[PDB]
Amino acid sequence: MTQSPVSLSASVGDTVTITCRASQGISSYLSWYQQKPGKAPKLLIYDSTTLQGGVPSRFSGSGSGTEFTLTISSLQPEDFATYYCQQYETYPITFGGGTKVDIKRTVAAPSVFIFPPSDEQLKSGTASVVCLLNNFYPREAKVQWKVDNALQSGNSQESVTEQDSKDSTYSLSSTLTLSKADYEKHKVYACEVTHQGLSSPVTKSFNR
């Protein structure tokens, strides 16, 4: 089972297509679901082509055998969501990996900020260095950590907000977590940010 694409940007009024491939051939035993964040899934279409009562007519399912398409015509604001196919020819019942449809807007470069650990965090015995990428679009972004101008992997974690309801951007935190002894066996700390809105990777840094 293979659902594509993994993600998709569109505007209100567009027509979107999502596809599911099931190479073993599953006749018409496929359904489509919609899911919004923090909510239960909703069945849109079953038996490949049947629209569930109460689901808007702008949703249409097609296919038989190996390739299946969900077409969402004239996208409405309520349609920005994640979509999943489900195969039920055989057990185990299996879902596709999902397709997130988000809102298209113009490219916006992140504003990048770096936060040096407070004295009290250093007395903590564990220090967290935070790099903020603020209000960017599209979602795709890359963060690398550099200590003493040298690459560091393994001790960072990323967290991202949902698309902002006012300006349709994302924000992301990258947190580098080290022991106090380790925190400054080092001198200079930096994070380099790569994004489509930057003509070249931006680095913000500190030392002390």
Partner: peptide, 8 residues
């Protein structure tokens, strides 16, 4: 079929 495909 299985799941909702076997309710009948």
């Amino acid at each position: 079929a299985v799941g909702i495909g076997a309710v009948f």
